[PDB]
Each structure stands twice: as structure tokens, then as C-alpha cells.
Write a structure and sequence with these properties.
It is classed as heme-binding protein. The structure is a homodimer. By secondary structure, chain A is mostly beta strands. Chain A contains one helix and twelve strands, in the order E-H-E-E-E-E-E-E-E-E-E-E-E.
Chain lengths: ~160, ~160
């Protein structure tokens, strides 16, 4: 039986963090009202909004609510009455936000910008409007060596006009 | 300005909830005592252990500790004094573990088997022992992470090299 003179070892962390991040959403609870889910995306239907075709600006509003409680109780958030606001190829996703805190207290923030929109596609005619975007949470590159990278959160819409 | 006759939208939502949690890890805090970090991996250093080169069994000891606290203090975990044991192509990753639950309660699990090891490379001679293994969460390891992840969950892989005397 031989003694160890010198030894080294190497062990990562980003896969455990990924497990924690994915686990928190997957083991969580959802309550949906007036909203669907398909193709890994929540699904909205509306009949409301205004679109400026000249400046290519508009707002499309949708009824319906989503209430999420993360695994354990860590994140607890309701999002309702989403609005997609666009001005050219940039925009905002706005909604009624309610969130609960450490010890069960629920705070209503009213209309809140959920996130900012980067449009890869945006079309507006006299009869239709549509777009495709990424939702960015409104630099953490220093954490890239131990934190898994962010995931694209897609958003898209089509509207008939009148 | 034209009215909206009807409209549809699609929105992932789940990615943004994951990105929110990712932001709390990124804004967390690390305390490293006698452990380095490079190539996205914690770096352990030791001068302690024993290896039976005939039977290819061994135990390699490493001092030092790692402590993480996510922003908000909900994720809170400390691992110290890790030990890699092997027998054949199998083995155990052992460590002193302290962890918090969701409610801020700290629990000292003491010295426990964090995961079982399955070696993809394990070379042993009279002068050196080295190896690389995947890490599967044990049952006692699963309790020590406040039952976040089911037993058998894959952690990051681990590798080591040791000179013998």
C-alpha cells in the first residue's frame, strides 16, 4: 500500500447549476386561465389593439393569465393581460404582474414591463401585422465560467387588421 | 391607425423564468478556501492518501472548502475536504456537506457519500494513479442537497491524478 506524494483533482459546477435551474421550473406548478400551451410556448388569442402602418408601431393586447410557483416555492409570480408593444424592430412586453415574497406576502405591481423585445421579423400592411422576437430580461458575462448560458425566450404574433 | 380584428401570440415564458434563476446564481457569492478554479472546474490539491496498486483500490484526500450563496440566500451550500475512493472501475466521492433548505435552515450533514463514481479512465502503477469518472448523486447525497434532485442525478464529472511513494 503506497502513500500519496502529491495529488490534484478537477470537478465542475455548471451541470449542477443547470440541474437546479431546469429543476426549479420542471417541478413547479402552473395555473392557466384563458391561455393555451403548444409547441413549448404559451398560446394567446385576442381581439384588441392598434397598429400604425406608416411608422410601423403598435400594441397588441391579449386577455388571460399565467400563475407560476417554482419548485419549493422559490419563485411565485402571476402574469396577466399581456401586451406586445413595438416601435420598429424593438419593443416591450408589458403585463399585469403580481409576485409573492419570502414569507407569503403578495405584491401587485400593476402594469409592468416584463421584458424588452428584439425583433428578428416585423411586418405591417393594411390588412395584417406580424413579428418574431426574443424576450430579454429587463452584463453577467463574468459568470460564464460557472453559470450555464441564457436560453432564448421566443415571442411571436400575427394580427388581422380592419 | 387600424384596429385589431383578431390576433394570436406565442411566448415561451419558461426560458425567462430559467433566465431569472440563472441571474440569481450569477449574482451569487463564492468563498474558496484552498481550492482553485480554472477551465470552468474547481481545482483541488492534496498530499494525502493510500493506493493499493496490485488490486487497484485507493483513497485520495484533498483539504479545502467551497461555499456558494445565491442572491437572496435561498441557495446555500458548502462542501469540504473531498475524498475520491476507488475500487476497480467504481468508487465514491465523499465530502463534508452543509446545506440550507428553502426556508433558511442550515443543516450539517457531516461526512457523507455525495456521489458514486463510474470510471471511464483509471490508470494505476507503482508511481501514479489517475482517472476520470462520471458522478451520480447518491441517496445520502440527495438528502444533503435538501432533496432538490432525485438520486442518480448526474453531476459534473471529476478527474484526478496522484503521484505515489
Amino acid at each position: 500500500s503506497l502513500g500519496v506524494t502529491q495529488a490534484s483533482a478537477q470537478w465542475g459546477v455548471k451541470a449542477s447549476f443547470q440541474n437546479y435551474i431546469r429543476g426549479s421550473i420542471a417541478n413547479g406548478s402552473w395555473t392557466l386561465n384563458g391561455v393555451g400551451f403548444d409547441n413549448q410556448q404559451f398560446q394567446f388569442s385576442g381581439n384588441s389593439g392598434a397598429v400604425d402602418a406608416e411608422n410601423k408601431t403598435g400594441s397588441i393586447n391579449f386577455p388571460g393569465s399565467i400563475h407560476f410557483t417554482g419548485a419549493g416555492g422559490i419563485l411565485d409570480m402571476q402574469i396577466a393581460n399581456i401586451e406586445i408593444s413595438f416601435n420598429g424592430n424593438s419593443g416591450e412586453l408589458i403585463a399585469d404582474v403580481v409576485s409573492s415574497d419570502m414569507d407569503g406576502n403578495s405584491t401587485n405591481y400593476g402594469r409592468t414591463v416584463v421584458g424588452t423585445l428584439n425583433f428578428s421579423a416585423l411586418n405591417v400592411s393594411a390588412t395584417e401585422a406580424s413579428g418574431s422576437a426574443s424576450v430579454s430580461l429587463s452584463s453577467q458575462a463574468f459568470a460564464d465560467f460557472y453559470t450555464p448560458g441564457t436560453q432564448l425566450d421566443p415571442i411571436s404574433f400575427s394580427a388581422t387588421l380592419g
